[PDB]
């Protein structure tokens, strides 16, 4: 089940970094408004990627989570003192 | 900068017949 964390986590890292570079290369170049919302959606996707990393590390943490003489004498004095014979 | 023992049938056959 760790290979799914390898491929999934690594994919989230590549999408985060590469999508960040695509972001900065799209912030620097109704086309303007479409750039506004494409950049904003890339930013929010980076936020969801960071939150995804936090959830996966949380899943990692959850994976880390998931003699006889003293009795004879003691009971002897206990019974003798109890009954007061 | 960055990169991306034995055989169960033979043992039981010994326990029931004694052949090795």
């Amino acid at each position: 089940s760790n290979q799914a964390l390898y491929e999934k986590l690594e994919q989230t890292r590549t999408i985060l970094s590469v999508k960040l570079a695509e972001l900065i290369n799209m912030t620097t170049i109704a086309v303007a408004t479409t750039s506004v919302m494409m950049v904003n959606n890339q930013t929010m996707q980076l936020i969801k990627n960071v939150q995804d990393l936090l959830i996966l590390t949380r899943s990692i943490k959850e994976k880390w989570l998931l003699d006889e003489k003293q009795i004879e004498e003691l009971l002897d004095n206990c019974i003798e003192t109890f009954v007061a014979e | 900068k960055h990169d991306f023992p034995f055989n169960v049938d033979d043992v039981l056959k010994f326990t029931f017949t004694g052949e090795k």
């Binding site: 109704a30 086309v31 479409t34 494409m38 959606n41 | -």
Partner: protein, 56 residues
């Protein structure tokens, strides 16, 4: 009353953004052709009854 799952919401939002970008791309690709023609209704048009609609 209560918002459902977020996967369907974000998916529909991604479809909306895909449609907007898909329309703006072809629109910006054909910006010289649409500016080289005029469109206005023909006599075959019930304008004697409704006039503001044709303006809209």
């Amino acid at each position: 009353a209560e918002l459902p799952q977020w996967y369907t919401l974000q998916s529909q939002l991604n479809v909306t953004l895909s449609q907007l970008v898909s329309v703006t791309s072809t629109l910006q690709h054909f910006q010289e052709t649409l500016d080289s023609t005029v469109v206005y209704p023909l006599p075959k048009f019930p304008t004697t009854s409704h006039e503001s609609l044709v303006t809209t």
